[PDB]
Design a protein around this ligand. Sequence first.
Ligand SMILES: Cc1nn(C)cc1C(=O)NCC1CCC1
Length: 169
Amino acid sequence: PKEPEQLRKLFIGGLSFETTDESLRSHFEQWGTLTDCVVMRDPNTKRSRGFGFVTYATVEEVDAAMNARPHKVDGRVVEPKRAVSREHLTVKKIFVGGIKEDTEEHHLRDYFEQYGKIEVIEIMTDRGSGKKRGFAFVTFDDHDSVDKIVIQKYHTVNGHNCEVRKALS
Ligand SMILES: Cc1nn(C)cc1C(=O)NCC1CCC1
């Protein structure tokens, strides 16, 4: 079963107005098979609107393209992003809930470091008693880690099934 198409799209902002469907394709085919590749244009002038999207055959190919940032396409550094949810923002921090009183920093680090480079791990404690409250925040150096994390259906850390959400600052 193919992964859902929505999870195989990369939305590319910041394009050069000279980038075409064809030149965007030739660039991003370096990291996988593309089933779709679109530059958005004005319906009347045909002038570029400066953004588009590509669709890879697999999620691993999306990962390969994101791991190859920064992407300079037709002379300009562009901004690729995975699909955002409706309401959500592009952030570098997550809330991790349901970790209870026995989960330590190294449990969170060993798991989440495989999504991206961690900068801060904050295990929350009670302001009055100092006891652990059962949730934590993890900050990464880049938003794609968070984008990969929050689209997973399940997160298991230290045996616990955790609730993970984007955290706004
Ligand atoms: C979801 C989503 N997440 N991001 C970052 C962009 C989208 C999106 O739906 N873009 C609209 C299409 C691009 C051609 C029209």
